[PDB]
């Protein structure tokens, strides 16, 4: 063929058509936008032709001479894509931060992007995913190491829901960062099982506890969706607007924003069949999920069988003026809640980055992307998940898509926990299900129930729980 197969490979794997892919890659390679030179060829009997010639990297990328502008320009785009994949190189960012100020969170901002671009070196297909990106860092005595890294701003479609837990439900960046943190915590539990000195855990009174000084810090390159975003308006509001601007919100599969609920509105539980019949699945907003994280811990229900609750010590958002309303949304809405005993409402430190208000990038061409990467230190490799169905789409030897569950899905988390239980000789019931395993954490279940009940009784709203059949699958 006159066009290299790598052009088709890039077009297919990037999820972008050749014209859009050429437009994107020309802008990422040089400082200009493709312009087509409409040359014409005349036959002796009279004819009109177009070539739509584009010049790039000093190479003549003259396309096929054809009747109209469309086919000639798309052929020139194909050849220009051949050119951009030739001369192997890609855009990178040097550090541009300021010092001596409150730049610790800015240190977290640069190291998140710097780590992401390092991953792009080994896997070129994740380029451009960093428009919406979150990461988790582990700190001890001034030493910080990135733990989890993820992108994405979209959720599972209602058509693609499954009862076996193989699909990622919410592929927002911070949620996937928390899931990568969960995988890292599982790895650390295993390490404590084999090498207690080298692990971050130590034997507490009733469960594993973090060694002193070890902290976890969440960074998000944009404000989490929900009331942490709805409060961008600096005007304080009048009276009832304060309570109105603090109620729970839920997400739509693809909506870039969130929808406020009501006072006993949406009290009817979601049903699996309803979502399949066409009802839009409701997922709690990332602001409410972060409030839940700072009330109940980030470790989740399953890890509570091994470890004591773990909380984010700080949450950083790449916005210049976010300290007040992010803190309100993330901590203050439940500051008066009293969890049962192992848990507490974490007074998370709120940090602001500098240099760039990142939401310029998060709002441009980030709506188009439908796939999300996730990286964590425990696995050490990147993974791309198509957010529409929330599962990994690899390429077969003979073509067509083969689709496999992500490592962050419910089934894989349950399998990892069962593997740890087998290795550490922990006795578990054979016929348990995913829901029964999570319900097994008595203290965590009680704390979650009390938190939901308190949110209801304080008029904050109704927590939009998923249908029970999302989690009835048996692991063993």
């Amino acid at each position: 063929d006159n066009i290299p197969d790598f052009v088709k490979e890039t077009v297919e794997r990037s999820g972008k058509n050749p014209m859009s892919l050429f437009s994107e890659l020309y802008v990422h390679m040089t400082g200009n936008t493709p312009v087509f030179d409409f040359y014409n060829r005349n036959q002796p009997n009279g004819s009109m032709k177009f070539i739509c010639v584009v010049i790039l990297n000093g190479e003549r990328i003259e396309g096929n001479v054809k009747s109209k502008k469309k086919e000639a320009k798309v052929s020139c785009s194909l050849k220009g894509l051949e050119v951009v994949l030739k001369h192997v190189s890609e855009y990178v960012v040097p550090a541009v931060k300021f010092e001596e100020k409150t730049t610790f969170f800015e240190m977290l901002r640069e190291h998140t992007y710097a780590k992401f671009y390092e991953l792009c070196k080994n896997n070129a297909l994740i380029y451009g995913f960093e428009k919406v990106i979150a990461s988790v860092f582990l700190k001890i005595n001034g030493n910080l190491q990135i733990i989890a890294l993820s992108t994405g701003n979209k959720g599972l479609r209602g058509d693609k829901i499954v009862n076996d837990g193989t699909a990622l439900i919410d592929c927002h960046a911070e949620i996937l960062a928390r899931r990568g943190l969960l995988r890292f915590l599982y790895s650390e539990v295993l390490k404590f099982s084999t090498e207690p000195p080298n692990s971050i855990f130590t034997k507490g009174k009733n469960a594993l506890v973090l060694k002193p000084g070890i902290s976890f810090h969440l960074f998000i390159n944009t404000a989490p969706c929900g009331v942490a975003r709805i409060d961008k308006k600096l005007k304080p509001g009048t009276s009832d607007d304060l309570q109105n601007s603090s109620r729970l919100r839920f997400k739509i599969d693809k909506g870039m924003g969130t929808v406020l609920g009501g006072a006993s509105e949406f009290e009817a539980p979601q049903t699996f069949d309803g979502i399949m019949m066409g009802e839009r699945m409701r997922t709690m907003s990332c602001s409410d999920k972060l409030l839940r994280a700072n009330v109940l811990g980030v470790q989740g229900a399953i890890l509570s069988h091994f470890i004591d609750p773990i909380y984010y010590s700080s949450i950083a958002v790449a916005e210049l003026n976010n300290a007040d309303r992010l803190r309100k949304a993330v901590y203050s809405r439940a500051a008066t809640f009293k969890p049962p005993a192992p848990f507490h409402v974490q007074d998370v430190e709120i940090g602001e980055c500098q240099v760039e208000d990142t939401e310029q990038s998060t709002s441009a061409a980030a709506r188009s992307t439908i796939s999300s990467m996730n990286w964590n230190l425990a696995d050490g490799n990147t993974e791309v998940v198509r957010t529409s169905d929330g599962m990994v789409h690899d390429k077969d030897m003979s073509g067509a898509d083969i689709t496999t569950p992500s490592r962050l899905c419910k089934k894989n988390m349950a399998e990892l926990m069962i593997t740890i239980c087998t290795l550490t000789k922990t006795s578990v019931d054979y016929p348990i299900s995913y829901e029964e395993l999570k319900a097994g954490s008595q203290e965590y279940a009680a704390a979650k129930k009390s938190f939901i009940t308190w949110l209801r009784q304080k008029d904050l709203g109704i927590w939009q729980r998923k249908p029970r059949e999302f989690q009835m699958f048996t692991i063993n």
Binding site: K115, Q145, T426, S427, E435
Partner: protein, 152 residues
Amino acid sequence: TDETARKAATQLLDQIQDTPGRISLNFETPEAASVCPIPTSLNQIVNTKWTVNQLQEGQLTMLLAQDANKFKSLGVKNIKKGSVETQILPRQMDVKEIVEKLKKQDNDSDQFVGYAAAVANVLRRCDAETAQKITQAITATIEKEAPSIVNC
């Protein structure tokens, strides 16, 4: 700016590029500590033997590669738990009274979700032949009652 502070700042910026994802703050000089001040609540300096170098990329993959003999017990017990109801194997096959009500019920401001769910429920439990013969009847009724909807 002091020479030591500038040196510490340049070291931090260079470490951004040299080892991405790893941050090593410097405390042996209070001037150097002024370059990147940690929040006072986040400082929490503690003497410890653990180091950040104990974390290796892909540690989970290597850890699962070891044989089970090197893993010691954590000293815990895991027991399932009260999941509400059994709402028997999915509150899917819902009790026959519910489908009887839904099919009989007329006020469908619910946007026809419940009625279609009931139709699916009664369809599933019927045998292959009975369910097979019903579906052509349903398709034909749809095509004959509302041709503009389906035959357009």
